[PDB]
């Protein structure tokens, strides 16, 4: 989906110097909304591999993909690629890379936290249009993972503080707005994680050679056509037309 | 380019760019002049302090409000307010920013004409538009129907809107507002022993009103409780000392809204004007107006006003209707949020009064279909 | 005593909101049975009106 | 292929494919226009609400029936009704579907000619046909003789048919119908203190008329009972509360059918017109005509109308003649059922008016023997 782009730099005397990599146009709609016959990113399915038991129990991940709301809406699993040894290969590639295993563990735990954002529930109040949570166990475990406070996170979601002039005031949110905010936060944190990972890879790949004129290599998704075209396909078609 | 949303309001000027979630600059609309002589030579005091700066020098100035009830009465002070807002608060040149202005219903046409003339001539704004406070309040409330009660510091009015269609014959305007409440608080504080007369102490009385006053669900029961119990008394710290304790005077000032006979007004309370406005409309939309009662404005920020008004309307209305009152926490800034939403719409871009149209048709172009 | 009153307020609001949601459920179910009672009353009313018209004719 | 059976009527458009047991789409035939200006921008309100949508926006629209008494007076509105029926309620393109139409007896020829012209030109239907609203009702009752009383909302008429041979010289048409009853109820509800003026609340009054009104077997006895006791009073809940109670007015509204002098018309009552049409025919078929009275149309759905009409006609008719009135539960939709039955016949396939025939013969083909 994302528009991979690699810049290959050269030396002053026309000799290979270094490589610079960038990413563009990564789609966030795939994270939350999926077509009925299509899957999400391979990340979540790969994490649910049973060959690594330590991650599941240390993250308190439900082993059943059906229970999680964000994943079960799309097609649960296909025989595309056997996820197990692919996950182990990615883990080995990360291990032989420049950074330590604590960053990898932070990556997995952050992804697990993204997973538990769908379990949040909200209900109307006594005699007001405001919304309040009913269950808090998933909120408690997510806050524990992120190192936040569950009460503070719930208060922030229900009552967002905003700055007016020189004074802070609190805003009200109903169920629809808080669900939209929950989805937007999950998309944004995933985007930031991907961008930070790309920056880390670029830094590790970086050599100390000077960067004179470069040769760019661009990869982009094609002009996909379906019989059930939607917004995600519309953006891709518009980009291809440009 | 980007659009600019300015809300003159009454007693508070709030402005900011369109597409923002909150106004950047909020400050009182006060112009003050020094009333003493001044003996030090070299400092060179300016002859007019405008905006929030006049609050700092409150003790040596005569604070004058340029507008009484919506209508601008001192135009030069209003050019000063607008110049301050455009230059010392937003630090932008209005030469390349369309300006959206907010204006109360049922006001003299000369007011709008002069406003547009000043905007087009003095500041040379490329385009501008004037809108009604209630429509913006309904925009920011996430609603398309329902009757909205906008009660600021200048004037209180109700405008019923159903399915995006207004009911001009059912618009009711009442001049009772926050300023009259402050004046009544002054008149009722002197019976305890505290006298406030100077315009500087107007701000102190207003601050006491904001910080301590509240609306009682029942009047007679609360008065009976306060006649014997002393649990309703709270102390306030003046800017120099001598703390003052007020008893039943804290919940008697906002009762003027529901009992306008206290300050001699002939009209009825807001709870009754809302019901009368609802019954003015057609019979087929009264249920939706009952179920979508919207509140806005600073004066509607008193604790417990929503419950009191719901009880009063439920008493007035038939027993077979569900009366629901919407009181978002951001009542005060609802109008500006609605203005930002309105100016950020793409289909609104052809409804501006451009400079060419104003030049061709004169100031009278405001009262055309570009209302 | 400020903290003591705050704790008193907290469990008081907890108990009153519990009773309030109980009352909401109660009023909802009695409103429903009000609908069925009114429906049965009007059903019997016009059924007897029809049968009385048949009897008189 | 399939045939469409559209029944415009007056105040209720009902349609569906031929061969169906019941009509598929039933909705009032009204066109609404917004009488206010609209303050919210970007919504993009349509300039005309048509069909069942206008019933939900009664409070901000003015409702005009395109059909006054059988005839069409506003052709643009009728075209809008037809377009809505073909493209939204049924969602079928009329390019490849024949249509069967109905109208009342004794109507202007210009109406029929213009209907045919519009239906071949605007919609380009392959073929169409016009049938009398009473003959179809006779088909739907499984009969072949007897008279049929089609009391709709626009017009009331009687068509005597014996053994499939119509008698044109004995057809009686009366302009009193449901609309006049609703107007009379509106007029007589004022004496109780309720005022209904707006066209929107005419629908409310129609709801009361449908729900509570009934025909009394005896007028003087019921009048005395209502004047003495109060057991006949019932209460109706308006859309905005304030439940109202109607007493003597409950059965005075439908009595206008048997007492046309209440609304000032000189013509005789329904029973008298039926008897006059019965005796207008020959003498050898009067017994069969007496024994096969058929009722249809919405207006004939009042409780107890059958008994009162039978009593009146028995009083008029000779004692040694058996009198029976057929009142099926599906009176309102009987005409459409008969139309579907007629369109499902195999022998009727050659009676359609082909488009080529219309082009060759002009719009006057319908009045020609190729009916
Ligand atoms: N928390 C509060 N409680 C009571 N009154 C308040 C509160 N906040 C503001 N007000 C009153 O509201 C007024 C401000 O109204 P404002 O929204 O500025 O009106 P406008 O929009 O017409 O300028 C002030 O004069 C103040 O007296
Ligand atoms: N049960 C009823 N009681 C009273 N009025 C009725 C009843 N049923 C139908 N009507 C009246 O009949 C009218 C509709 O008659 P309808 O047969 O649809 O006329 P058309 O065929 O010309 O559309 C409505 O205006 C309605 O008020
Ligand atoms: Mg205001
Ligand atoms: Mg009819």
From Swiss-Prot, chain A:
Report the residues modified as Phosphothreonine.
136
Q: Give the UniProt subcellular location, in the record's own words.
A: Cytoplasm, Myofibril; Cytoplasm, Myofibril, Sarcomere
User: Which cystines does this chain contain?
Assistant: none
Q: What does this protein do?
A: Myosins are actin-based motor molecules with ATPase activity essential for muscle contraction. Forms regular bipolar thick filaments that, together with actin thin filaments, constitute the fundamental contractile unit of skeletal and cardiac muscle.
In the UniProt entry, the disease listed is: Cardiomyopathy, familial hypertrophic, 1: A hereditary heart disorder characterized by ventricular hypertrophy, which is usually asymmetric and often involves the interventricular septum. The symptoms include dyspnea, syncope, collapse, palpitations, and chest pain. They can be readily provoked by exercise. The disorder has inter- and intrafamilial variability ranging from benign to malignant forms with high risk of cardiac failure and sudden cardiac death. Congenital myopathy 7A, myosin storage, autosomal dominant: A skeletal muscle disorder characterized by prominent axial and proximal weakening, spinal stiffness, severe scoliosis, with or without respiratory and cardiac involvement. The age at symptom onset can range from early childhood to late adulthood, and disease severity ranges from asymptomatic to severe muscular weakness and respiratory insufficiency. Histopathological examination shows variable findings including subsarcolemmal hyaline bodies in type 1 fibers.
The entry's family comment says: Belongs to the TRAFAC class myosin-kinesin ATPase superfamily. Myosin family.
Whom does it interact with, and what assembly results?
Answer: Muscle myosin is a hexameric protein that consists of 2 heavy chain subunits (MHC), 2 alkali light chain subunits (MLC) and 2 regulatory light chain subunits (MLC-2). Interacts with ECPAS. Interacts (via C-terminus) with LRRC39.
* Miscellaneous comment text of the record: The cardiac alpha isoform is a 'fast' ATPase myosin, while the beta isoform is a 'slow' ATPase.
Entry's free-text remark on domains: The rodlike tail sequence is highly repetitive, showing cycles of a 28-residue repeat pattern composed of 4 heptapeptides, characteristic for alpha-helical coiled coils.
Q: Would you tell me the protein name for this molecule?
A: Myosin-7
Where in the full protein does the shown chain start and end, and how long is the full protein? Answer: 243 to 484 of 1935
Curated annotation (Swiss-Prot), chain C:
**Which compartments is it annotated to reside in?**
Cytoplasm, Cytoskeleton
Q: Which domain of life is it from?
A: Eukaryota
Q: List the disulfide bonds.
A: none
**What segment(s) does the record annotate as region Disordered?**
2-22
Q: In which tissues is it expressed?
A: Detected in primary breast cancer tissues but undetectable in normal breast tissues in Sudanese patients. Isoform 1 is expressed in adult and fetal skeletal muscle and cardiac tissues, with higher expression levels in the cardiac tissues. Isoform 10 is expressed in adult and fetal cardiac tissues, but not in skeletal muscle.
Subunit structure, per the record?
Homodimer. Heterodimer of an alpha (TPM1, TPM3 or TPM4) and a beta (TPM2) chain. Interacts with HRG (via the HRR domain); the interaction contributes to the antiangiogenic properties of the histidine/proline-rich region (HRR) of HRG. Interacts (via N-terminus) with LMOD2 (via N-terminus) and TMOD1 (via N-terminus).
Family, per entry: Belongs to the tropomyosin family.
Disorder noted: Cardiomyopathy, familial hypertrophic, 3: A hereditary heart disorder characterized by ventricular hypertrophy, which is usually asymmetric and often involves the interventricular septum. The symptoms include dyspnea, syncope, collapse, palpitations, and chest pain. They can be readily provoked by exercise. The disorder has inter- and intrafamilial variability ranging from benign to malignant forms with high risk of cardiac failure and sudden cardiac death.
Write out the function statement from the record.
Answer: Binds to actin filaments in muscle and non-muscle cells. Plays a central role, in association with the troponin complex, in the calcium dependent regulation of vertebrate striated muscle contraction. Smooth muscle contraction is regulated by interaction with caldesmon. In non-muscle cells is implicated in stabilizing cytoskeleton actin filaments.
Record's domain comment? The molecule is in a coiled coil structure that is formed by 2 polypeptide chains. The sequence exhibits a prominent seven-residues periodicity.
Which named protein is this?
A: Tropomyosin alpha-1 chain
Source organism of this protein record: Homo sapiens
Primary gene name: TPM1
Question: Which span of the parent protein is shown here?
Answer: 115 to 171 of 284
């Amino acid at each position: 989906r994302f528009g991979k782009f690699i810049r290959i730099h050269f030396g002053a005397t026309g000799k290979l110097a270094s490589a610079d990599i960038e990413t563009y146009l990564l789609e966030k709609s795939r994270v939350i909304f999926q077509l009925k016959a299509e899957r999400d990113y391979h990340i979540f399915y790969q994490i649910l591999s049973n060959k690594k038991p330590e991650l599941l129990d240390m993250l308190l991940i439900t082993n059943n993909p059906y229970d999680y709301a964000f994943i079960s809406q799309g097609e649960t699993t296909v025989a595309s690629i056997d996820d197990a040894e692919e996950l182990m290969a990615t883990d080995n590639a990360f291990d032989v890379l420049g950074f330590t295993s604590e960053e990898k563990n932070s990556m997995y735990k952050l992804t697990g936290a993204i997973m538990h954002f769908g379990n949040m529930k909200f209900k109307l109040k006594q005699r007001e249009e405001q919304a309040e949570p009913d269950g808090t166990e998933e909120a408690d475990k997510s806050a524990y993972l992120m190192g936040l406070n569950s009460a503070d996170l719930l208060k922030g979601l229900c009552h967002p503080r905003v700055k007016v002039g020189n004074e802070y005031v609190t805003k009200g949110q109903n169920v629809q707005q808080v669900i939209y905010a929950t989805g937007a936060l999950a998309k944004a944190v995933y985007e930031r994680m991907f961008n930070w990972m790309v920056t880390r890879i670029n830094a590790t790949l970086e050599t100390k050679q000077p960067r004179q004129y470069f040769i760019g290599v661009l990869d982009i998704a094609g002009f996909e056509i379906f019989d059930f075209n939607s917004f995600e396909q519309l953006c891709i078609n518009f980009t291809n037309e440009k | 380019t980007t659009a600019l949303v300015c809300d003159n309001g009454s007693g508070l000027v709030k402005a900011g760019f369109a597409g923002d979630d909150a106004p950047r600059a909020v400050f009182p609309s006060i112009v003050g002049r020094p009333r003493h002589q001044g003996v030090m030579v070299g400092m060179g005091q300016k002859d007019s302090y405008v905006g929030d700066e006049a609050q700092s020098k409150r003790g040596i100035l005569t604070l004058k409000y340029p507008i009484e009830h919506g209508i601008i009465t001192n135009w030069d002070d209003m050019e000063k307010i607008w110049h301050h807002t455009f230059y010392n608060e937003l630090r932008v040149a209005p030469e390349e920013h369309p300006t959206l202005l907010t204006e109360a219903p049922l006001n003299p046409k000369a007011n709008r004409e002069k406003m547009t003339q000043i905007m087009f001539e003095t500041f040379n704004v490329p385009a501008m538009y004037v809108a009604i406070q209630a429509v913006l309040s309904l925009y920011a409330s996430g609603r398309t129907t329902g009757i909205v009660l906008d009660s600021g510091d200048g004037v209180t009015h109700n405008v019923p809107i159903y399915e995006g269609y207004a009911l001009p014959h059912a618009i009711m305007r009442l001049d009772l507002a926050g300023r009259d409440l402050t004046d009544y608080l002054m008149k009722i504080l002197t019976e305890r022993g505290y006298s406030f007369v100077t315009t500087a102490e107007r701000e102190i009385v207003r601050d006491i009103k904001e910080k301590l006053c509240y609306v009682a669900l029942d009047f007679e029961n609360e008065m009976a409780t306060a006649a014997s119990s002393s649990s309703l008394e709270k102390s306030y710290e003046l800017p120099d000392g001598q703390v003052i304790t007020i008893g039943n005077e804290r919940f008697r000032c906002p009762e003027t809204l529901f009992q306008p006979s206290f300050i001699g007004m002939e009209s009825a309370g807001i709870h009754e004007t809302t019901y009368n406005s609802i019954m003015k409309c057609d019979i087929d939309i009264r249920k939706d107006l009952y179920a979508n009662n919207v509140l806005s404005g600073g004066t509607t920020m008193y604790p417990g006003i929503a419950d009191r008004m719901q009880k009063e309307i439920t008493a007035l209305a038939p027993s077979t209707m569900k009366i629901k009152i919407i009181a978002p926490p951001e009542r005060k800034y609802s109008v500006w949020i609605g203005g930002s939403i309105l100016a950020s719409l793409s289909t609104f871009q052809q409804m501006w009064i451009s400079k060419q149209e104003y030049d061709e048709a004169g100031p009278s172009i405001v009262h055309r279909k570009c209302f | 005593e400020a903290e003591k009153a705050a704790d008193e307020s907290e469990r008081g609001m907890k108990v009153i909101e519990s009773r309030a949601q109980k009352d909401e459920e109660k009023m909802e179910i009695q409103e429903i049975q009000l609908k069925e009672a009114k429906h049965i009353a009007e059903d019997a009313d016009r059924k007897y009106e029809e049968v009385a018209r048949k009897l008189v004719i």
